[PDB]
Design a binder for these strands. Structure first.
Lengths: 139, 37, 185, 82
RNA sequence: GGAAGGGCACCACCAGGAGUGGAGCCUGCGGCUUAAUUUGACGGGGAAACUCACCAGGUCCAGACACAAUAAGGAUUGACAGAUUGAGAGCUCUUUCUUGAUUUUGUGGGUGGUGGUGCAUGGCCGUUCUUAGUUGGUGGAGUGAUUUGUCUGCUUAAUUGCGAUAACGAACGAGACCUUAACCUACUAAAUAGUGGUGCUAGCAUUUGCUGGUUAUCCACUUCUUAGAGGGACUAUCGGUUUCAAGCCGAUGGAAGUUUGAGGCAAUAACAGGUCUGUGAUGCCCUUAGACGUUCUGGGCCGCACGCGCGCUACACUGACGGAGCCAGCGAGUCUAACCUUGGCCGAGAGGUCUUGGUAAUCUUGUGAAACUCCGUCGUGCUGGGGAUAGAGCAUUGUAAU
């Protein structure tokens, strides 16, 4: 957690573009998530730098790894609104396959309600993908 | 270099605490250097 | 059973961190390798919050701060009233002070002082019965600001009656405490 | 029988004198041999802040020698945490 | 109203002292010049890289979703080594190959508001009027506007008080609250402080002594170092001055007698004062081939007829040189690093080597600083004052010292 955001960006590119779906799940859930929550939690204005945003952007190339590693325990650890805007712009800018976007929406609709979760569901509804009927029933 | 809130203007660079003289007098009542004389 | 050093350090952390979430006291019990620290609480809707709040916040704050991994210690909560705002605990305390040889005046001053230090808008203690004399007497001890009529009686004031048995006879303690209407919530 | 020196430091005089006097009373009430509370000079840490002004801090130090077994030393060190 | 009168101040004058502006140079501004000499009026703006906000270039990475094509015999995305490649890094295609719609191209409302300036809301670091005389409650008398309070006098640093008197109350002022200074051989108390006595021990004259070594040889103590408790000062007292009132001045006693001196603290009446990387189908130029984001090199920010200014060093004999004596205090010091360094050897020195002590009233440290004291050289001669400028080499920190 003592790296620079350039180092976290490059290591996220390395450890998502090479490691598999479960392995980059463990990488993002252990190394990126705790450094993420400690960059935003320990700061007095509770915002994030630009290169951690680019790291979370580059972590979505394997979408199983992204959703199973980044988004799903973060909302269960307390997600605020700068994380919502930043990781929602992450969730918007990168083209995600429809199945893991559908599993993500099926996750986020079940959560305890929060306007960060509302921003993430709003980004996943900006896709208008070919959703399975279970994801439609969760809506 | 300000490593707290990106506030290089007036760092107090002594002892590496590195708070600007604006925010140093924000956090002046947390360390203990206060008004006696 | 954990030590009072840990308990007082959590008191020091809570008194500076739970400044406007109602930290009344701490109940704590220790089972093998599990220290259960129940935050005794003024109002607990600051503690519970909107859809599960301060308990998760302080749990993750201790895990992030005091270098605890999830699984070693556990954090609990219970819903009670503020000990000063409640007339029941203050009536228990008034009964306690009268049974331990403290007179009407100093016990009434101490209990009303503790209630006004708690943060109640006002309080009143009514003490009736006989104290070393044949003739019965009653004594009012009111402070702050109280209301006596209407639906705000049902809303804002707590009343508690206690029959406290002394060696001469019986005394009737009537504690009436007015809670802060801005903090109604 | 372990000889341990306790070096106490504080910013305010009343709580530091209270802690030192509690050490003296409790180590005196069960017959421990000891040196009295040696009172080090109060060091004055100051910063000249932007005419000019001065910010000050008084730091008070005592130290007390004690000779006691492990149980009494541990109970004294645990209870006197303030 | 350009009447006059007081404060009350060395950012004012007199008594002066040190001076600047005179010489050289350091440094800040202006001007010129440039490709840039980034930009404000000390900007913690000390300084080759960074910081850098400026130039000469070379580059990455953009742009969401929707939507028409394109398909696994291949769109393509990556692990590559070679041809590379200019100054560096990128970039393209030949394979060894993962390829797997993450497609690729061109578009359509805008994702991106890490593109933002304005409207509101809440509010804040430096604050500052750090409110030192005013306010209003009425009274009355006057169509309105106005009189009084808010005054003949006297007095205080003050609208602070006295007094007369259309008068009668209250608030914030102001005094006042906080924090400091100095004297305590009267307390209370010591190996992270010291003093003396005393053991062991070194030298010198010996007739007793002097100088000491000795982080335990023991003791006492705080005389000095130090932590507090208190105490004291409240103008104590005397005499002028003052309605002989609140008060001022001269003198004595006093550690302290100008409010013993300074600064922080409110309430009321001004700050668009400076942002929050704030929220709101907010208004609005584009929505991106812009670099706004990134880099990576090399030059700048220092350049010079000159002007505005502050400093350093001199013009010497109350001085320069050569020796000797060697007097302080505030600080400050290293961890998951290279800090402060004692000592010993080498080197003319710069410095280097080898260690050691100290996370600290302990070691650096007794910081053996400088000015100063004494004795010799000089002999008033731009001199043996000056040290600007320039040459040569040698070392240290820094990747890189032009």
């Amino acid at each position: 957690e003592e790296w620079s955001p350039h180092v976290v960006y490059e290591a996220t590119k390395l450890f998502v573009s090479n490691l598999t779906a479960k392995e980059s799940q463990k990488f993002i859930n252990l190394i990126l998530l705790e450094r993420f929550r400690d960059n935003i939690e320990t700061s007095e204005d509770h915002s994030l730098n630009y290169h951690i945003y680019r790291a979370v952007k580059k972590s979505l190339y394997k979408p199983s790894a992204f959703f199973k590693g980044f988004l799903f325990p973060l909302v269960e650890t307390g997600c605020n609104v700068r994380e919502a805007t930043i990781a929602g712009s992450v969730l918007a800018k990168v083209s995600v396959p429809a199945l893991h976007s559908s599993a993500a929406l099926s996750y986020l609709l079940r959560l305890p309600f929060s306007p960060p979760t509302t921003v993430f569901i709003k980004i996943l509804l900006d896709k208008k993908y070919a959703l399975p009927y279970q994801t439609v029933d969760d809506c | 270099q300000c490593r707290v809130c990106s506030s290089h203007t007036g760092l107090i660079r002594k002892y590496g605490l590195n708070i600007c003289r604006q925010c140093f007098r924000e956090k002046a009542n947390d360390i203990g250097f206060n008004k006696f004389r | 059973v954990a030590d009072g050093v840990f308990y007082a350090e959590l008191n020091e952390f809570f008194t500076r961190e739970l400044a406007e979430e109602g930290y009344s006291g701490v109940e704590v019990r220790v089972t093998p390798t599990k220290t259960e620290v129940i935050i005794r609480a003024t109002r607990t809707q600051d503690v519970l919050g909107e859809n599960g709040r301060r308990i998760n916040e302080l749990t993750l704050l201790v895990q992030k701060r005091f270098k605890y991994a999830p699984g070693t210690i556990v954090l609990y909560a219970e819903r009670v009233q503020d000990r000063g705002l409640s007339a029941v605990a203050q009536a228990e305390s008034m009964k306690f002070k009268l049974l331990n040889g403290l007179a009407i005046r100093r016990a009434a001053y101490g209990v009303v002082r503790y209630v006004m230090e708690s943060g109640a808008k006002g309080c009143e203690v009514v003490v009736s019965g006989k104290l070393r004399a044949a003739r019965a007497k009653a004594m009012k001890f009111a402070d702050g600001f109280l209301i006596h009529s209407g639906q705000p009686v049902n809303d804002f004031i707590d009343t508690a009656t206690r029959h406290v048995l002394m060696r001469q006879g019986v005394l009737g303690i009537k504690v009436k405490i007015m809670r802060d209407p801005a903090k109604s919530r | 029988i372990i000889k341990i020196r306790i070096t106490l430091t504080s910013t305010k005089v009343k709580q530091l004198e209270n802690v030192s006097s509690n050490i003296v009373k409790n180590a005196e009430q069960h017959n421990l041999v000891k040196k009295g509370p040696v009172r080090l000079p109060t060091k004055v840490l100051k910063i000249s802040t932007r005419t000019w002004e001065t910010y000050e801090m008084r730091i008070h130090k005592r130290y007390i020698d004690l000779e006691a077994p492990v149980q009494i030393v541990k109970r004294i060190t645990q209870i006197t945490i303030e």
